Amino acid sequence: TSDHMDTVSQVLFHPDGTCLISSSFDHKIKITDIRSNKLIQHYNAHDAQVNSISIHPTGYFLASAGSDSKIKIWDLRQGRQIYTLYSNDKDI
Amino acid sequence: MNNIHTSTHVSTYFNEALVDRIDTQKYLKSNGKIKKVVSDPDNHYTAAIDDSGNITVIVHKLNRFVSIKPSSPATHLVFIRNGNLLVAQQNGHISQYLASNGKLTSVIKHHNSKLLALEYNPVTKQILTIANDQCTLWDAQSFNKIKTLFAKASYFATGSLTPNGQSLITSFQDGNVYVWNLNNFEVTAKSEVEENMKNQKISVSADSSRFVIGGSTAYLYYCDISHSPLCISSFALPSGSTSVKKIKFTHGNYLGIITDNQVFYAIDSSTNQIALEFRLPKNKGITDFDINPNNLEILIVSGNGEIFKYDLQKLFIMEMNQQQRLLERGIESSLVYNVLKPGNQNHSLKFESH
Amino acid sequence: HDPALSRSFRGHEDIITCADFDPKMRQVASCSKDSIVYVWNFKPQQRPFKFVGHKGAVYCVKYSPDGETIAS
Known about the structure:
This is part of a larger assembly, with two copies of chain A and one copy of chain B (354 residues). Chain A is 0% helix and 37% strand. Chain A contains no helices and seven strands. In chain A, the strands form two sheets. In chain A, strands 4-5-6-7 form a four-stranded antiparallel beta sheet, with no helix packed on it. Chain A starts with 19 loop residues before the first strand and ends in an 8-residue tail after the last strand. Chain B is mainly beta. Chain B is built from four helices and 27 strands. Chain B is globular, with a radius of gyration of 20 Å. Chain B starts with 10 loop residues before the first helix and ends in an 18-residue tail after the last helix. Chains in contact: A-B. Chains A and B meet through loops of A and loops of B. Chain A: Required for structural maintenance of centrioles, ciliogenesis, and cilia-based motility. Chain A: Belongs to the POC1 family. Chain A: It is found in: Cytoplasm, Cytoskeleton, Cilium basal body.
């Protein structure tokens, strides 16, 4: 609580299995490392009933999904949200 | 002695350069006249409501129509991309028909209200109903519910969804305008305001960076998310406005307005000034509107019984020209439009939102 | 440089919770919230397989890196 509110969603990893990624019902992704359980940024997520995620294989993109039907993609090499996607009815 | 007539700001504009006609002889069969317009988010299936109330979907390429047998009138219609019609009926229920047949498929009920104002978000699959003291949010397929927003006392006036994105804004009689996490039932943004307004409605842009509030008092409020508070300012209206009955957003930075002086207006929110002014003969009159955004194809229902028959995009030509001829002289738009100046905090609907 | 929704899995009954892929590029596995998972490919003339199991919801399906076994 690394701050999450409820039932945590998918936990993802840096390509090397480090810097794990998590969010839950709370609208934020935390990217935190292993043992050295330190945060690099708050990857604010969707205001979803619940969120969801996968990260592009290169570890560059956080695909922020969730129970609501807005979808957005993050660029981890920048730390910006790239943008909120058109989405067009997708509670991914 | 004395008041204003006749039809010079409306039927003369509306029918200026048509390529077809609503041959109203085929529609106004009631002993009586057309009273209200409700309409299609997919634009083409706009519909007429007469003093009987049967909804006639006017199909503006066929000069044919869908006669919906039940006489119950709509507050507004919602249609989806797949061919269905969701009718917010004035009977307290929302009734879905195959749009393609006028064939009843289902009814959404839970509401106890006279009004069920609808808005449909085609990019969320979500339809919202504004009714009585609640907002019902539901899956646009319309066979279940998502949430019932409500309050302990402040009574509800309005709210809406965002069609090319998503965020839910609602307001109370208090004028308090606030933003919801529509999927968590969270008020994430809150306001307390000075201007209380009866029967106010919130117009929500498809990309809801911008919002507008109407209501029983003669004011209009405009929001812009790029600035804090989201509602940064308020302003009073062109002389003669008494209240605002209906406000709706279009594609450009614009909203249609119906006031209770029955004059309709088109407002440019980039400046908060009126582009178009619409007037009809004494009662008779202008009663409601339908704006279809790509060209602003319009269905207008006038108390004069005429069913229009126009595109605002085409009417804007007259206030594109005119103004551009005057721009050769250098006429100022803030006067042409009547820009409505931001006022005091004493009557604002100022609202912080993120 | 487009999100590129291409062509969806037409026919998914309702209620969808996941997907994974066979890196042949590709066969797609997907799963519903009730009794069913699907596996199909492009060359769209190809037809999907409808698998029955997971009488309750199925939340996730996954393929081995060779696109072989699909755990569900």
